[PDB]
Design a protein around this motif. Structure first.
Motif, PDB file in Angstrom:
ATOM      1  N   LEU E   2       0.805  -1.216   0.000  1.00  0.00           N
ATOM      2  CA  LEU E   2       0.000   0.000   0.000  1.00  0.00           C
ATOM      3  C   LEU E   2       0.841   1.270   0.000  1.00  0.00           C
ATOM      4  CD1 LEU E   2      -2.955  -0.785   2.457  1.00  0.00           C
ATOM      5  CD2 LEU E   2      -2.946  -0.834  -0.046  1.00  0.00           C
ATOM      6  N   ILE E   5       1.659   3.130  -4.318  1.00  0.00           N
ATOM      7  CA  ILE E   5       0.466   2.953  -5.134  1.00  0.00           C
ATOM      8  C   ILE E   5       0.560   3.724  -6.442  1.00  0.00           C
ATOM      9  CG2 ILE E   5      -1.120   2.312  -3.284  1.00  0.00           C
ATOM     10  CD1 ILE E   5      -1.925   5.274  -3.125  1.00  0.00           C
ATOM     11  N   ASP E   6       1.754   4.208  -6.801  1.00  0.00           N
ATOM     12  CA  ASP E   6       1.919   4.913  -8.069  1.00  0.00           C
ATOM     13  C   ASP E   6       1.567   4.023  -9.254  1.00  0.00           C
ATOM     14  OD1 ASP E   6       2.695   7.166  -6.702  1.00  0.00           O
ATOM     15  OD2 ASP E   6       4.846   6.848  -7.014  1.00  0.00           O
ATOM     16  N   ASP E   7       1.706   2.705  -9.100  1.00  0.00           N
ATOM     17  CA  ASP E   7       1.254   1.795 -10.146  1.00  0.00           C
ATOM     18  C   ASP E   7      -0.256   1.880 -10.336  1.00  0.00           C
ATOM     19  OD1 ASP E   7       0.727   0.763  -7.666  1.00  0.00           O
ATOM     20  OD2 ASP E   7       1.289  -1.299  -8.155  1.00  0.00           O
ATOM     21  N   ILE E   8      -0.998   2.166  -9.267  1.00  0.00           N
ATOM     22  CA  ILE E   8      -2.444   2.343  -9.364  1.00  0.00           C
ATOM     23  C   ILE E   8      -2.805   3.784  -9.704  1.00  0.00           C
ATOM     24  CG2 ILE E   8      -4.625   2.114  -8.120  1.00  0.00           C
ATOM     25  CD1 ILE E   8      -3.439  -0.077  -6.474  1.00  0.00           C
ATOM     26  N   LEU E   9      -2.101   4.749  -9.106  1.00  0.00           N
ATOM     27  CA  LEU E   9      -2.446   6.154  -9.297  1.00  0.00           C
ATOM     28  C   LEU E   9      -2.202   6.606 -10.733  1.00  0.00           C
ATOM     29  CD1 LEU E   9      -0.981   7.674  -5.982  1.00  0.00           C
ATOM     30  CD2 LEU E   9      -3.333   6.927  -6.440  1.00  0.00           C
ATOM     31  N   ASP E  10      -1.159   6.082 -11.378  1.00  0.00           N
ATOM     32  CA  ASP E  10      -0.831   6.504 -12.733  1.00  0.00           C
ATOM     33  C   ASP E  10      -1.706   5.840 -13.788  1.00  0.00           C
ATOM     34  OD1 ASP E  10       1.141   7.988 -11.504  1.00  0.00           O
ATOM     35  OD2 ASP E  10       2.785   6.648 -12.064  1.00  0.00           O
ATOM     36  N   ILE E  12      -4.944   5.959 -13.714  1.00  0.00           N
ATOM     37  CA  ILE E  12      -6.188   6.719 -13.826  1.00  0.00           C
ATOM     38  C   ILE E  12      -6.238   7.492 -15.139  1.00  0.00           C
ATOM     39  CG2 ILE E  12      -7.676   8.402 -12.688  1.00  0.00           C
ATOM     40  CD1 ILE E  12      -6.471   7.688 -10.072  1.00  0.00           C
ATOM     41  N   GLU E  13      -5.094   8.002 -15.590  1.00  0.00           N
ATOM     42  CA  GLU E  13      -5.024   8.848 -16.782  1.00  0.00           C
ATOM     43  C   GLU E  13      -5.679   8.202 -18.003  1.00  0.00           C
ATOM     44  OE1 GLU E  13      -0.917   9.718 -17.398  1.00  0.00           O
ATOM     45  OE2 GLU E  13      -0.689  10.856 -15.535  1.00  0.00           O
TER      46      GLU E  13
END
Lengths: 296, 14, 432, 425, 13
Positions: E2, E5-10, E12-13
């Motif tokens: 956790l 989470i940049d793998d999840i946050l990026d 979104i684009e």
């Protein structure tokens, strides 16, 4: 002027080592000076509904607010707050409020969905019931706060025109003011009860919303004032719907007994849930007598 | 020429 | 603070035994100390219409208001009011206003159709011409009241808000507000420590706020006249978000111009009413700033926008003569304000006297005509930019033509083309 | 009380013979005592656009306001104003404001289309850029004026209310108020800087409209106050959006300073253009340093908690996400209000708002992750409710899956379904 | 897992 930490129906230490932080229709919150720290006790009137509890206060909370779902605690100098839900299901959470030089938390308030912190500089910080900040607002210096659902009733002090009040709804859309720092028609104070008027110089013994949403305030003149028709700023009126100075004289049937004083808890439609204090001091001590009611 | 414009101002009446 | 009984244009007793209760365009009401009672004399300015009368005041009336159909008298302490219609048709009537501990009647007002009583606690008690009570309203403490037909202009003062005003209509059923307790930007008096031996201190003890008079104009706009001797008019009071108090007369400046630029200290203005563009007043010559006995004949003072500078007026003179180029700016501004005010009146209330549409027409005419002189001066100095902005403010299309012809005589063909674009743009918006 | 002539970011003479008249994002105007007259120097920050010039002041102008098209000068006592357009194409013009006994001009302001003069008696005189008067208005005594296009932000002072403010629009037709004498909750001052507070009693270092048209004020408490929701009178709130004392405290690595101060110029979106004054006095000196930039920060950081995380200040990511959430929330709400009512002004508002809402969710999702870390299912759900983009609600479900909180996942998926069914109505 | 989470946050684009 000295901004003193305020809580509804709070009492001073006086010469004892214990006092009441806050107090209303839900219950009463006391704190005791022990050897080194403090001991805070949260008690209820409907003992069959909530579990009474106590804890060790390592910080010295001098601010409190009590609702039907949790208890909000505040430290006026360190800017530390803590919210303890009544139910063990939800977590206790702690937060520290930023404070500039000489800035003090002057009043806190909480609802099932909102937590409010007001300061002597006019800062108005709102949160949800978990500690998530929603907005930081700058108003006039705040001296007294209370809330109910999404409404907020705040008493402010200006250097110029003195005491004023604001009434706002922290709705899901945006905050909306029904009254904005309007005249607060309250009588300021005019001994043995001299320790109190240093603990609360403005004489505001307590303030709260009625069971039907109207703001109420109980001044040192011991008159319950209610703000009617605030949804229409044209017809807004403050009504003295109860003079407890006469209700004691009328109910006693005898003479002017200065041994009896009224301590307000809340207003529930038709009765004033309150505490009747017997003694030289106008503020209740220990143990706390049973709550009584008063017809309007 | 510009100092006396009363000849122009009175044409507004009509 | 001490609320004092107020009446429009009332004067204090001072060091005499007689004062004026109230005073306006209709007439003046005086009271004389008569041993232990009083002698009230109601006098009129149109001696042909009304007959002056007088009566014995056994109550001590210190409040009064005069309209064209009757006279209202009030006693601030006992709470007794009396309305005396001028004509014998309707009888006089008397009421006693309920007053609490220390509550005083602070101002009374009456029109031919309404009677208003305001108290120091903010009680607003209204009646019709016969004394039938309307609903009772609690407002901010009232310090001054004037009225006209069915509309009431009230001034309120708290120690919290300061000086506010309210503008309401007393309809058949209940009271409706046009404006409720908006700020009243009237300048309060500035009393010194040397004023404790000044001859005029008696006035500011009798009227602490310095409201010399307040009234509706002949066209229904609220006006107030403070101790700064500036006439303030409320414009756009029908649109709450647009309401503005406009200073339309610096009477100290008019006096300075009457005296040929010389500063005086013995001439003062006492306001009676505002008729369109002219302030009916009393010119008080003497040591005190309020009129005494006998009363002079009313004078007339045309309103002037406070845009004249004393320094610049002295140079152009070297009765004050005003340079045509400088007088055009004031005449433009004044016509603009008057036209804006009268247009609002006609569009909402219609005519009231029968000749307003002609007044507005000649007013708008003077607006363009004054505006065209400013335009000519800008063309004179080759200021094409300033001239074009001036042409945009022109009203009549026939005045746009006059600008084209003025621009041609100035040999500014670029401007001429730009002015004709205004005509085209206005023709285009008249069809869309 | 003594009303003092005010100009945005003006400095006092002190013990010298020169001060700054006014100062903002366009440039700075200085005045130098010259025997019995004055030497005014108008200087610009974009040297390519406008050319620095100077002229001889035979009147003693102590009031000034600078915009991108001209400079307005005012003399508080004689009542004389002068407007000098930057381009030599447009002519200078001079007027004399009528002043009564003891009346002083307290503040002047100018836009490319309007010239504003406020007096101590409450006279509000407006003109166009050429000097044609529109109307004279009487209000409460005016202490400070700023303007932008057709809108005016005025600060008033009575002996009753204290400091109030008004927000109006000088349209083509008439003057309309958005807010009329509402309370101005700016902290008044409560010494080496006594020279300043005699020159500016209110302590209003500067006031201005933001680049996006929101009113801002900068008091002696060095906190930037922004007026939010000014288009809806019952929703107006003054929001503290920058504690410059804290930013300096954080620049200095937690060390308390006494020689670094901020002098405000303007607010561009999220950045406060300012002058960093190093020295004994709080106002800038000669020569003027180059303008600095200070990004606005919601006052939610505690000094106590920031010292612990270091043991230039480093901010813990979990704490900086909360501040970034609040700051994005406020900026997004403000910019949307602008676009929904006034449209665009610079050409990048729609793109800024898009990236702003993006940063809002991203910071909000970090707080969501921290709540799942502490097994706080309730706090996390409340955070997910505040998410904007539907693609971020999905990202929360995936974060909840990595935390093995299937109870939370279902409640978040109920939020997504509820929003999808509002997409059907 | 956790904390980054940049793998999840990026995505979104």
């Amino acid at each position: 002027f000295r901004y003193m930490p305020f809580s509804p129906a709070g009492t001073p230490f006086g010469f004892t080592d214990r006092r009441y932080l806050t107090m209303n229709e839900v219950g009463y919150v006391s704190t005791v000076k022990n050897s080194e720290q403090y001991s805070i006790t949260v008690s209820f009137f409907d003992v069959g509904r909530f579990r009474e509890y106590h804890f060790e206060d390592l910080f010295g909370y001098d601010l409190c607010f009590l609702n039907e779902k949790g208890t909000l605690f505040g430290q006026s100098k360190t800017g530390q707050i803590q919210y303890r839900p009544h139910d063990s299901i939800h977590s206790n959470w702690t937060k520290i409020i930023p404070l500039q030089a000489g800035e003090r938390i002057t009043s806190v308030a909480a609802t099932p969905v909102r937590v409010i912190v007001g300061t002597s500089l006019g800062y108005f910080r709102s949160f949800n019931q978990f500690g998530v900040p929603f907005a930081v607002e700058k108003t006039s210096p705040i001296v007294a706060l209370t809330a109910q659902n999404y409404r907020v009733f705040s008493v402010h002090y200006s250097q110029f025109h003195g005491l004023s009040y604001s009434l706002s709804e922290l709705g899901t859309s945006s905050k909306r003011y029904y009254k904005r720092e309007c005249p607060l028609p309250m009588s300021l104070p005019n001994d043995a009860n001299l320790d109190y008027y240093n603990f609360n110089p403005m004489g505001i013994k307590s303030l709260f919303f009625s069971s039907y949403g109207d703001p109420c305030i109980f001044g040192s003149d011991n008159t319950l004032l209610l703000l009617s028709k605030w949804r229409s700023p044209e017809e807004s009126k403050w009504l003295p719907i109860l003079d407890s100075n006469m209700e004691i004289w009328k109910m006693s049937g005898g003479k002017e007994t200065t041994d009896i004083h009224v301590w307000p808890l809340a207003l529930a439609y038709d009765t004033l849930n309150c505490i009747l204090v017997k003694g030289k001091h106008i503020w209740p001590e220990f143990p706390l007598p049973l709550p009584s009611e008063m017809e309007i | 020429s510009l100092r006396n414009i009363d000849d122009i101002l009175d044409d507004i009446e009509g």
